[PDB]
Design a protein around this ligand. Structure first.
Ligand SMILES: NC(=O)C1=CN([C@@H]2O[C@H](COP(=O)(O)OP(=O)(O)OC[C@H]3O[C@@H](n4cnc5c(N)ncnc54)[C@H](O)[C@@H]3O)[C@@H](O)[C@H]2O)C=CC1
Ligand SMILES: Cc1cc2nc3c(=O)[nH]c(=O)nc-3n(C[C@H](O)[C@H](O)[C@H](O)COP(=O)(O)O)c2cc1C
Ligand code: SF4
Ligand code: FES
Lengths: 430, 213, 85
């Protein structure tokens, strides 16, 4: 198989993505959720982890770590402490609005994902850290969790398998940093959402000091569909080390900004023209694309022609996959203003813990605010490159990396627009 | 917009604040979601509950939460200054949160911000003189395919125009509550011009179940 | 800790009184500003005995090795959890 995309309605894991069906238990049971969950759980953690490592599922949060290898770090003997699955539902990324749809429209798929994943890792319960802005989604998920308890699907004697597994929803309070896994752990512990240092990875010391796996809502909710359909089926979508389906958020300057599910290596031009109704003005109106949410570097029109929307081809296209949240930008876009407002986001959402992010992200925002007006001289572009390279790799979590990357993408692909902005500032003010 | 407290006549540790008894039942239910010895983990939902009761946090809700959870007051002060929901000044009753990050800015949230400024008669950060509306400018609220959007105290009002947000503010000033969703023809997140996916009915339970399960 | 590498030899401090004209610190001790630097301890001991100076010896105090664990800041059941970070 060399051609990818054109994912059919039968191979969609997230059926009822659109809220067109009943999200409650009577609707979710009619779509495959909570079917043979007892026979999934009775087959031990080892078979579940074998099917997930078979399935090629990587991290749907955005980093793309191999999910089954990650979950096997909890497959270890007990030493007095309990174990927890924690479901990362914060979703603060600009461009990214898909886990909101998973919580709001397929909640029982998330609860069955919590049950199967916590069985895979021996976890006692599940803390689902939802965003505090998602209040309707949180009440929605608590309704579905009450439906799961009252049907006996979770809790005492979960689905009749003799396993005990609670599912909790902890609401956030408006911090983009509390989507990073250790800052999320600290936000569960009643503290400031400041990220911990790695190691300890949460499989050793996580929430409350217990062994812990923090995974995304997407890479938790697709796990019972993997454990039902088999590993190699889900592995037969997308390229190798790019196994499966993915929820894309084609936002920005398109005719139909939408959330859709598609095969993992679908082309970007085909995705925009086939699901979003194309760029506003056709393909000849495209200027740049932020391919996977705000923390990934933009890429211009000459790269977006042939590029594939997965991890490896976007790393070869000097960006990252990330959350697979496509932000489309046309020729009517002040692009330096857009990246400067994105750096303004990354300083208004940055917890101020370590030195390079706390000072350098504010300093990059001031330099970008002068770049928008053009109030600079062309040595400062290379200066800003060196500032971004000093932030990148010197932080505690990847918000410093995810803030240095839009600057590096903007400079790397649009240095001349910065230079002509500055020189027309210099002619009209002197 | 400051991160220290100065004792006003209306904000001090002798400002009256206490929970209703149903809020004490809810606080016990919150604390029961956390392990024994980690009672300090419930600072965030109990302080959020204090905001839901009072509308905002004086420094008596912070001290009451610190008293009932037996944590220091400083550790609740860190939480209430760290997060952008714990309102430490009394906001208006409708708290209009306009998102202005890059996906909402690409679909002209600035026209909506100007429309709210000329419809209410205020600017960013201020409060209307009836104390019903407070307009601030927030970061990404996570509704990016439904950009541009706003949040009014709990509820996302999406796919807006200037006229849609004028209409929503008008039916807020009439004392009612609008419908929390998009204001274009679509319902949640589908393509606006029609369903490019999920057209077929689902297969039902048991589709594609491998042998041995 | 680079100033804790070498042995030093100072002397007992004598009277520093107020100059009547300007209020300066007048002294009558010529050995008041004399600090001698030595690599090891027996070098300083032999140099003090060689010059007939009565001496006392205070041993080099190394900071004892600690056990540091960043994971101890987030324990499950010990008191070494931190209430903030
Ligand atoms: N989904 C969202 O809303 C957002 C996603 N992101 C994504 O997050 C990415 C950054 O991810 P991070 O969490 O900073 O780190 P990431 O590099 O380390 O690691 C991914 C996961 O694997 C685990 N892991 C990694 N190396 C490990 C090792 N040696 N041993 C054990 N476990 C290990 C980590 O605990 C983590 O859960 C960005 O590139 C971006 O794509 C960023 C912002 C928002
Ligand atoms: C600053 C920052 C914010 C993050 N926010 C989220 C988030 O909101 N949701 C999410 O699922 N992952 C987020 N992540 C990625 C997590 O650290 C973690 O990789 C992920 O939640 C779980 O790993 P997974 O990709 O295997 O699911 C964030 C990372 C960083 C550095
Ligand atoms: S780099 Fe920024 S986001 Fe990360 S621990 Fe430091 S202040 Fe926090
Ligand atoms: S950009 Fe406004 S909702 Fe994400």
């Amino acid at each position: 198989k060399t051609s990818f995309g054109s994912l059919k309605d039968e191979d969609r894991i997230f059926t009822n993505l659109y809220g067109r069906h009943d999200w409650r238990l009577k609707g979710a049971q009619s779509r495959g959720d909570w079917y043979k969950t007892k026979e999934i759980l009775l087959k031990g953690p080892d078979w579940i982890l074998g099917e997930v490592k078979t399935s090629g599922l990587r991290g749907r949060g955005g980093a793309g770590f191999p999910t089954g290898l990650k979950w096997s770090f909890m497959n270890k003997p007990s030493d007095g402490r309990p174990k927890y699955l924690v479901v990362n539902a914060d979703e603060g990324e600009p461009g990214t609005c898909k886990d909101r749809e998973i919580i709001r429209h397929d909640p029982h798929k998330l609860v069955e994902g919590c049950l199967v994943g916590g069985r895979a890792m021996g976890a006692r319960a599940a803390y689902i850290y939802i965003r505090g802005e998602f209040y309707n989604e949180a009440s929605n998920l608590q309704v579905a969790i009450r439906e799961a308890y009252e049907a006996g699907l979770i809790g005492k004697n979960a689905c009749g398998s003799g396993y005990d597994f609670d599912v909790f929803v902890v609401r956030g309070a408006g911090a983009y940093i509390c989507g990073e896994e250790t800052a999320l752990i600290e936000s569960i512990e009643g503290k400031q959402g400041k990220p911990r240092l790695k190691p300890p990875f949460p499989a050793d010391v996580g929430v409350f000091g217990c062994p812990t796996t923090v995974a995304n809502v997407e890479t938790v909710a697709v796990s019972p569909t993997i454990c039902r359909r088999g590993g190699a089926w889900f592995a037969s979508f997308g390229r190798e080390r790019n196994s499966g389906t993915k929820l894309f958020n084609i936002s920005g300057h398109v005719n139909n900004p939408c959330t859709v599910e598609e095969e993992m290596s679908v082309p970007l031009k085909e995705l925009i023209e086939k699901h979003a109704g194309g760029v506003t003005g056709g393909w000849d109106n495209l200027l740049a694309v932020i391919p996977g949410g705000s923390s990934t570097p933009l890429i211009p029109k000459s790269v977006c022609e042939t590029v594939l929307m997965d991890f490896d081809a976007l790393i070869q296209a000097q960006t990252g996959l990330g959350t697979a949240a496509v932000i489309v930008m046309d020729r009517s876009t002040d692009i330096v203003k857009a990246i400067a407002r994105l750096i303004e986001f990354y300083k208004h959402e940055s917890c101020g813990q370590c030195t390079p992010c706390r000072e350098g992200v504010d300093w990059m925002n001031k330099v970008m605010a002068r770049f928008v007006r053009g109030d600079a001289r062309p040595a400062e572009i290379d200066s800003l490159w060196e500032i971004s390279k000093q932030i990148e790799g010197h932080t505690i979590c990847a918000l410093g990396d995810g803030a240095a990357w839009p600057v590096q993408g903007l400079i790397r692909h649009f240095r001349p627009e910065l230079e002509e902005r500055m020189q027309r500032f210099a002619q009209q003010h002197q | 917009a400051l991160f220290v407290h100065r004792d006003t006549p209306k904000n001090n540790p002798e400002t009256p604040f206490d929970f209703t008894p149903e809020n004490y039942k809810r606080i016990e239910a919150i604390v029961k979601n956390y392990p024994e010895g980690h009672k300090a983990a419930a600072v965030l939902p109990v302080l959020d509950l204090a905001q839901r009761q009072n509308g905002w946090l004086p420094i008596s809700a912070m001290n009451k939460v610190a008293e009932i959870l037996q944590v220091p007051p400083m550790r609740v002060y860190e939480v209430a200054t760290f997060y952008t929901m714990y309102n430490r000044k009394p906001v208006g009753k409708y708290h209009i949160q306009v998102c202005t990050t890059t996906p909402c800015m690409l679909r002209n949230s600035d026209s909506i911000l100007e429309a709210i400024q000329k419809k209410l008669g205020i600017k960013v950060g201020e409060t209307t003189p009836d104390k019903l509306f407070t307009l601030i400018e927030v970061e990404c609220l996570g509704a990016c395919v439904n950009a541009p959007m706003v949040q009014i105290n709990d509820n996302y009002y999406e796919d807006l125009t200037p006229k849609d947000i004028e209409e929503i503010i008008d039916e807020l000033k009439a004392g009612k509550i609008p419908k929390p969703g998009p204001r274009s023809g679509r319902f949640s997140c589908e393509p606006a011009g029609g369903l490019t996916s999920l057209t077929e009915p689902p297969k039902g339970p048991g589709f594609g179940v491998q042998a041995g399960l | 800790v680079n100033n804790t590498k070498k042995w030093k030899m100072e002397f007992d401090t004598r009277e520093r009184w107020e100059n009547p004209l300007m209020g300066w610190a007048s002294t009558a001790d010529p050995l008041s500003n004399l600090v001698l630097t030595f690599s090891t301890k027996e070098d300083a001991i032999a140099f003090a005995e060689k010059n007939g100076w009565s001496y006392d010896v205070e041993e080099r105090k190394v900071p004892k090795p600690k056990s540091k664990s960043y994971g101890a800041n987030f324990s499950w059941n010990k008191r070494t959890r931190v209430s903030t970070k």
